[PDB]
Design an enzyme around this catalytic site. Structure first.
Site, PDB file in Angstrom:
ATOM      1  N   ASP A 150       0.795  -1.210   0.000  1.00  0.00           N
ATOM      2  CA  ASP A 150       0.000   0.000   0.000  1.00  0.00           C
ATOM      3  C   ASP A 150       0.836   1.272   0.000  1.00  0.00           C
ATOM      4  O   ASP A 150       0.308   2.360   0.285  1.00  0.00           O
ATOM      5  CB  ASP A 150      -1.042   0.002   1.167  1.00  0.00           C
ATOM      6  CG  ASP A 150      -0.422  -0.156   2.527  1.00  0.00           C
ATOM      7  OD1 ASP A 150       0.819   0.196   2.671  1.00  0.00           O
ATOM      8  OD2 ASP A 150      -1.092  -0.530   3.514  1.00  0.00           O
ATOM      9  N   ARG A 196       1.097   6.841   0.115  1.00  0.00           N
ATOM     10  CA  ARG A 196       0.295   5.822   0.796  1.00  0.00           C
ATOM     11  C   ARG A 196      -1.094   5.751   0.171  1.00  0.00           C
ATOM     12  O   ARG A 196      -1.781   6.787  -0.053  1.00  0.00           O
ATOM     13  CB  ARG A 196       0.185   6.241   2.283  1.00  0.00           C
ATOM     14  CG  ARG A 196      -0.728   5.346   3.144  1.00  0.00           C
ATOM     15  CD  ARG A 196      -0.160   3.920   3.254  1.00  0.00           C
ATOM     16  NE  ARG A 196      -0.755   3.178   4.384  1.00  0.00           N
ATOM     17  CZ  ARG A 196      -1.938   2.595   4.327  1.00  0.00           C
ATOM     18  NH1 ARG A 196      -2.698   2.665   3.239  1.00  0.00           N
ATOM     19  NH2 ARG A 196      -2.384   1.899   5.359  1.00  0.00           N
ATOM     20  N   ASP A 222      -5.584  -1.060   3.916  1.00  0.00           N
ATOM     21  CA  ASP A 222      -4.450  -1.505   4.738  1.00  0.00           C
ATOM     22  C   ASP A 222      -4.052  -2.893   4.239  1.00  0.00           C
ATOM     23  O   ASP A 222      -4.808  -3.874   4.367  1.00  0.00           O
ATOM     24  CB  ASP A 222      -4.857  -1.543   6.214  1.00  0.00           C
ATOM     25  CG  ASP A 222      -3.716  -1.860   7.122  1.00  0.00           C
ATOM     26  OD1 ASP A 222      -2.607  -1.274   6.927  1.00  0.00           O
ATOM     27  OD2 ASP A 222      -3.972  -2.566   8.133  1.00  0.00           O
ATOM     28  N   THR A 223      -2.831  -2.981   3.699  1.00  0.00           N
ATOM     29  CA  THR A 223      -2.260  -4.299   3.370  1.00  0.00           C
ATOM     30  C   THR A 223      -1.451  -4.814   4.543  1.00  0.00           C
ATOM     31  O   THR A 223      -0.964  -4.026   5.340  1.00  0.00           O
ATOM     32  CB  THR A 223      -1.390  -4.258   2.118  1.00  0.00           C
ATOM     33  OG1 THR A 223      -0.431  -3.177   2.239  1.00  0.00           O
ATOM     34  CG2 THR A 223      -2.191  -3.927   0.859  1.00  0.00           C
ATOM     35  N   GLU A 247       1.910  -6.085   6.423  1.00  0.00           N
ATOM     36  CA  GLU A 247       3.276  -5.782   6.257  1.00  0.00           C
ATOM     37  C   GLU A 247       3.980  -6.880   5.503  1.00  0.00           C
ATOM     38  O   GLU A 247       3.494  -8.049   5.424  1.00  0.00           O
ATOM     39  CB  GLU A 247       3.921  -5.655   7.626  1.00  0.00           C
ATOM     40  CG  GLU A 247       3.410  -4.434   8.409  1.00  0.00           C
ATOM     41  CD  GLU A 247       3.458  -3.143   7.605  1.00  0.00           C
ATOM     42  OE1 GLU A 247       4.563  -2.742   7.186  1.00  0.00           O
ATOM     43  OE2 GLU A 247       2.381  -2.500   7.430  1.00  0.00           O
ATOM     44  N   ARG A 299       3.764  11.549   3.962  1.00  0.00           N
ATOM     45  CA  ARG A 299       3.438  10.720   2.781  1.00  0.00           C
ATOM     46  C   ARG A 299       2.316  11.322   1.999  1.00  0.00           C
ATOM     47  O   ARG A 299       1.308  11.766   2.547  1.00  0.00           O
ATOM     48  CB  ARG A 299       3.080   9.263   3.189  1.00  0.00           C
ATOM     49  CG  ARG A 299       4.212   8.611   3.979  1.00  0.00           C
ATOM     50  CD  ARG A 299       3.904   7.175   4.442  1.00  0.00           C
ATOM     51  NE  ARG A 299       2.711   7.156   5.272  1.00  0.00           N
ATOM     52  CZ  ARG A 299       2.155   6.052   5.749  1.00  0.00           C
ATOM     53  NH1 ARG A 299       2.734   4.870   5.539  1.00  0.00           N
ATOM     54  NH2 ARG A 299       1.006   6.152   6.415  1.00  0.00           N
TER      55      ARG A 299
HETATM   56  C1  LIG Z   1      -4.082   5.691   4.931  1.00  0.00           C
HETATM   57  C2  LIG Z   1      -3.739   6.752   5.964  1.00  0.00           C
HETATM   58  C3  LIG Z   1      -2.906   6.512   7.023  1.00  0.00           C
HETATM   59  N1  LIG Z   1      -2.635   7.490   7.931  1.00  0.00           N
HETATM   60  C4  LIG Z   1      -1.807   7.237   9.104  1.00  0.00           C
HETATM   61  C5  LIG Z   1      -2.634   6.515  10.166  1.00  0.00           C
HETATM   62  C6  LIG Z   1      -1.605   5.681  10.892  1.00  0.00           C
HETATM   63  O1  LIG Z   1      -0.902   6.548  11.805  1.00  0.00           O
HETATM   64  P1  LIG Z   1      -0.441   6.078  13.296  1.00  0.00           P
HETATM   65  O2  LIG Z   1       0.769   5.242  13.011  1.00  0.00           O
HETATM   66  O3  LIG Z   1      -0.193   7.451  13.947  1.00  0.00           O
HETATM   67  O4  LIG Z   1      -1.639   5.351  13.887  1.00  0.00           O
HETATM   68  C7  LIG Z   1      -0.600   5.350   9.804  1.00  0.00           C
HETATM   69  C8  LIG Z   1      -0.862   3.977   9.230  1.00  0.00           C
HETATM   70  O5  LIG Z   1       0.003   3.807   8.094  1.00  0.00           O
HETATM   71  P2  LIG Z   1       0.555   2.371   7.676  1.00  0.00           P
HETATM   72  O6  LIG Z   1      -0.625   1.452   7.532  1.00  0.00           O
HETATM   73  O7  LIG Z   1       1.288   2.620   6.406  1.00  0.00           O
HETATM   74  O8  LIG Z   1       1.450   1.931   8.823  1.00  0.00           O
HETATM   75  O9  LIG Z   1      -0.738   6.356   8.777  1.00  0.00           O
HETATM   76  C9  LIG Z   1      -3.227   8.745   7.790  1.00  0.00           C
HETATM   77  O10 LIG Z   1      -3.014   9.626   8.663  1.00  0.00           O
HETATM   78  N2  LIG Z   1      -4.044   9.016   6.780  1.00  0.00           N
HETATM   79  C10 LIG Z   1      -4.359   8.059   5.859  1.00  0.00           C
HETATM   80  O11 LIG Z   1      -5.198   8.303   4.959  1.00  0.00           O
HETATM   81 CA   LIG Z   2      -0.084  -1.392   5.973  1.00  0.00          CA
END
Ligand SMILES: Cc1cn([C@H]2C[C@H](OP(=O)(O)O)[C@@H](COP(=O)(O)O)O2)c(=O)[nH]c1=O
Ligand SMILES: [Ca+2]
Length: 129
Positions: A15, A29, A34-35, A37, A75
């Protein structure tokens, strides 16, 4: 929403991708998914799905939603298309991602993805097996 040409550099995992955006190399992102890891069950499959889908395409496009275009980690946040087919949706439809991280204001394609997720759940496919 509208699409615009994407300049991808490489797929990272299921993702996330690395993209040059306005001349800056950035991690993007995928919205609403959510994929697993890379080292979790179906992680390697989700990474390989996204990677091949963006590499085999003639044309990659990005589509921002209406809200924030960047997350707190710096991101980019977008939907991606490969030859017209949404990557975000394809991953959910194949049971290689859950619908997740649904924030108000960046949720245009939520219903479309929940439809895909329900089909993958009915088929007990991959993550839903
Ligand atoms: C998809 C997405 C993730 N995020 C944040 C939420 C999660 O933050 P926290 O780590 O603070 O909980 C993190 C998850 O990303 P990953 O799934 O890439 O790890 O990225 C956003 O803020 N907006 C989004 O649209
Ligand atoms: Ca992920």
């Amino acid at each position: 929403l509208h699409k615009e040409p994407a300049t991808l550099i490489k797929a990272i995992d299921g993702d996330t991708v690395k993209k040059m955006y306005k001349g800056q190399p950035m991690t993007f992102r995928l919205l609403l998914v959510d994929t697993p890891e890379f080292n979790e069950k179906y992680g390697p499959e989700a990474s390989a799905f996204t990677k091949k889908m963006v590499e085999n395409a003639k044309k990659i496009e990005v589509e921002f939603d209406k809200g924030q275009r960047t997350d707190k980690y710096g991101r980019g946040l977008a939907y991606f298309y490969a030859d017209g087919k949404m990557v975000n949706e394809a991953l959910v439809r194949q049971g290689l991602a859950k619908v997740a991280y649904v924030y108000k204001g960046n949720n245009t394609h939520e219903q479309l993805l929940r439809k895909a997720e329900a089909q993958a759940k009915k088929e007990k496919l991959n993550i839903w097996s």
